[model samples]
Target: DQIDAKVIRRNPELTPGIFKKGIEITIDLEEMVCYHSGLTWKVKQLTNTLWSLAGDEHTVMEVI
Candidate 1:
């Protein structure tokens, strides 16, 4: 199966993270609200300040 999952931004691995207040999409390819300046930025930018992934939510970072 071809996982056409989209990673909007990345640091080195281009994985998961939530940035501002709105919402942050994940590798699972869900279009959530993102607070990034670029609505659809490069897949090479990661500065969400928190880690947001597909598996599960973290208790610590989400508070950020």
Candidate 2:
């Protein structure tokens, strides 16, 4: 079955909190907006952060 967005957003363990502390930031793999190889998507969000799987960093592109 396909994964719903809500099911994909929160932690897998469904940890009771937002923003995993100490770890500081995390790229929710399940929430990842995937793209084709060597491709790019218009980095969308409140702040419009750049995102690329091939890029060196994993930033939380908070969509809303």
Candidate 3:
């Protein structure tokens, strides 16, 4: 993920350099389940990452 995200920039007070947080993720457990193949280890790891991301973004920053 890049440090600078593209923003629509609706705020007129800010300069053009303004950038939102770089990394973004969208996860739907229901959606993910559709791809589940009953692989317990893979499912566990994926769930772990999702759960971790729920905590703090800093955890990911350290890894990055």
Candidate 4:
């Protein structure tokens, strides 16, 4: 995940996540750039908690 994800921004506000906390979003076993419902956020960078979010630093829940 990279900081300053100000690139490729669209109508989405990229604010907090809608998913509940402590859930798991299936990943491709590599770096991630998560988004949903016209929103976007970075998966947690592993700070005690396994998942959070970046691009202002937040998080999400549940796996797809």
Best by TM-score: 4
Against the hidden reference, what TM-scores do the models get? 0.20, 0.17, 0.21, 0.34
For TM-score, candidate 1 versus 2, the one ahead is 1
Full ranking by lDDT: 4, 1, 2, 3
After best superposition, candidate 1 residue 56: deviation in angstroms? 12
Backbone clashes, each candidate: 4, 0, 0, 2
Residues 1-64, model 4: lDDT tens digits: 2232222222234444444333334432256655444554455444332434554443333232
Q: What tens digits encode model 1's per-residue C-alpha lDDT throughout 1-64?
A: 1112333333343234433233434322244332244444323213344433323232112312
Ranking of candidates on TM-score, top first? 4, 3, 1, 2
Q: Candidate 2 on 1-59: residue-level lDDT in tens? A: 11112111323342355323222222334445433223332222323333323232332
Q: Each candidate: what lDDT?
A: 0.31, 0.29, 0.24, 0.40
lDDT of 3 by residue, 1-64 (tens): 1121112222334344322233332333443211112321111112233322222222221112
TM-score of 3: 0.21
Query: Model 1 off-target regions past 4 Å?
Result: 1-11, 15-31, 40-61
Model 4 spans > 4 angstroms off: 1-17, 21-24, 38-40, 47-49, 56-64
Evaluation by lDDT, superior candidate among 2 and 4: 4
> Which runs in model 3 stand beyond 4 Å of their true positions?
1-22, 33-47, 50-64
Candidate 3, poorest ten consecutive residues by summed lDDT: 36-45
Clashing pairs in 3: none
The numbered model that scores best in lDDT is 4
